Ligand binder design. Structure first.
Ligand SMILES: CN1CCC(n2cc(Nc3nc(NC4(C)CC4)c4c(=O)n(C)ccc4n3)cn2)CC1
Length: 281
């Protein structure tokens, strides 16, 4: 049972859903799937308000998954609003935004150290493990959906696509992260593992999963460059780190490589990924 907020209270605390950036004095923080996330202040708490823009089933799925799943490595839904057509989700505000933005150092934020990147990777694996233990396939594991709290704790977000554990006609997810079988219509927790392997590569390299002015454009393609000995993992390590040691970087790359196996059955389960990430430290 979450808090039922009135639409006018959410409109009020977000400066009428001010579309200008926080930097300019507005309330827009960014945009998710089919929604804009705004900053607000409710009952002496900084909140994130996602205004969705059928899509109602994605809203209900987000609430249903959050009602069941409560873990330290998952975002915390505080409440919601559904007055008519304009649907809102209220969460505890994550001071350090998304892992994607922090890896890119968006808005001048300093680079994440190797030590903090390891903590985030283990945290994200714990969050996925909780989802899988509770029979849920996320279907959209990506660095934009891994938020970071006031202590850089990884928080898996966006459960609008989540499914309770197979084929489907409506294929959903982010192409640059999707597993080969997910792109074909299969719904399996093994696809979540593949997507997590892409997140690990993003953590190691600091490169986005897709960059149209880059060769290769798809980050997952670097796994083949390394395997065909054209490049090494050292060549791709994020240069914006001063504490990355080769042994732990190669240990994390070994996990990413295992997650990115083209055969879904050859990939390790989340408990094994979680085990390997703890062994790394
Ligand atoms: C320079 N400084 C500027 C402000 C930054 N920042 C802080 C936040 N807070 C934030 N953002 C969220 N999503 C994104 C990433 C905006 C799209 C979410 C979110 O999606 N949910 C579900 C819950 C909470 C939440 N909290 C975003 N950016 C940090 C760096």
């Amino acid at each position: 049972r979450f808090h039922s907020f009135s639409f006018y209270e959410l409109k009020n605390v977000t400066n009428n859903f001010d579309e200008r950036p926080i930097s300019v004095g507005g309330n827009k923080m960014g945009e998710g799937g089919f929604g804009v996330v705004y900053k607000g202040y409710v009952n002496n708490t900084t909140v994130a308000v996602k205004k969705l823009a059928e899509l109602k089933q994605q809203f209900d799925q987000e609430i249903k998954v959050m009602a069941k799943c409560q873990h330290e490595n998952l975002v915390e839904l505080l409440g919601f609003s559904s007055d008519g057509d304009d649907l809102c989700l209220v969460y505890v505000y994550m001071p350090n935004g998304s892992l994607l933005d922090r890896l890119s150092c968006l808005d001048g934020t300093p680079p994440l150290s190797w030590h903090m990147r390891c903590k985030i990777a283990q945290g994200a694996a714990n969050g996925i493990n909780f989802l899988h233990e509770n029979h849920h396939i996320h279907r959209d594991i990506k660095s934009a959906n891994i938020l970071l709290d006031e202590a850089f704790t990884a928080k898996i977000s966006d459960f609008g696509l989540a499914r309770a554990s197979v084929m489907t006609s409506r294929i959903v997810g982010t192409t640059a992260y999707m597993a080969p079988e997910a792109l074909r219509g299969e719904i399996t927790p093994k696809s979540d593992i593949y997507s997590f392997g892409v997140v690990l590569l993003e953590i190691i390299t600091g490169l986005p999963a897709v960059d149209e002015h880059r060769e290769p454009q798809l980050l997952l393609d670097i796994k083949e460059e390394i395997e065909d000995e054209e490049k090494t993992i050292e060549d791709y390590i994020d240069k914006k780190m001063n504490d990355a040691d080769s042994t732990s970087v190669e240990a994390m790359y070994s996990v990413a490589s295992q997650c990115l196996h083209e055969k879904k059955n050859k990939r390790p389960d989340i408990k094994k990924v979680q085990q390997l990430l703890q062994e790394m430290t």
